[model samples]
Target: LTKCQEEVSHIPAVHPGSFRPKCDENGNYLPLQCYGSIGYCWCVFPNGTEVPNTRSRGHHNCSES
Candidate 1:
């Protein structure tokens, strides 16, 4: 299982409401992550960490336009 799947199976036992990560069919991090309610989006690393300077109100094309 990929890290994404692993994380889902063993989600942190924290608050009932937390940001569940979005992963593709292959269980890879989606290049873009967003909080639509807050109107912000950012890029991410394969390990699900946010890429620096990628967060913004504008849309990011996932490392490449």
Candidate 2:
């Protein structure tokens, strides 16, 4: 594992229409931990769980999602 890999904490997918993929800026992902789901432009989930919501609402189409 990498250094940050051992970090024992999460950011929490704290934004509906947001993500953990709150997905990385460059389309990468770490882990889920956020409030919860809404837009591909802003979606949240667990291990890239299904599109959090619809586009008009929230959906994620990241590398892992």
Candidate 3:
């Protein structure tokens, strides 16, 4: 799991259609794509739970997560 940083540095601003690009053709937003140090990317939940290739709304609270 990733560690939460104290003294938050940056916060993402609200974007109405920000999640669209990550969605599929059916208009479904998917979980967050987190890239590892070695360029490995995957979808994960708000609680840092790894999820398979799937879409879900508000998977992560931060727009830049």
Candidate 4:
């Protein structure tokens, strides 16, 4: 289930949608997930220490961007 682009449906709830990656709050979102959908696009750091877990200055799109 790693690096998979196959879209999957979400469980029944208030908010329901389809996605490929199962990202978490720690910034583990897929590249496509960054381009709208859930909003808050992620920007990987250059140091590569924390990798995807890192966010640059916390500049994000709270809206649907």
Backbone clash total, candidate 2: 23
Worst 10 residues of 3 by lDDT: 1-10
Q: After superposition, how far is residue 64 of candidate 4 from its true place, in Å?
A: 22
Task: Write one digit per residue (lDDT tens) for candidate 3, span 1-65.
Answer: 12222111122223233321233233233245433223344565444445665434434443332
In candidate 1, stretches whose alpha carbon ends up further than 4 angstroms from where it belongs are 1-20, 63-65
Give per-model TM-scores: 0.61, 0.22, 0.30, 0.21
Report the C-alpha lDDT of model 4 over 1-65, residue by residue, as the tens digit.
Answer: 21222222342223334312333333334322332335433543321122454334334432211
Residue ranges of candidate 2 with Cα displaced over 4 Å: 1-28, 31-56
lDDT for model 4, on a 0 to 1 scale?
Answer: 0.32
> lDDT of each model, Cα atoms only?
0.69, 0.37, 0.35, 0.32
Model 3 reaches what TM-score against the true structure?
0.30
Model 1: residue 11 alpha-carbon error in angstroms: 9.7
lDDT of 1 by residue, 11-60 (tens): 65352445455566667877787655556778887668899998899568
Q: Which is superior by TM-score, 2 or 3?
A: 3
TM-score result, candidate 2 = 0.22
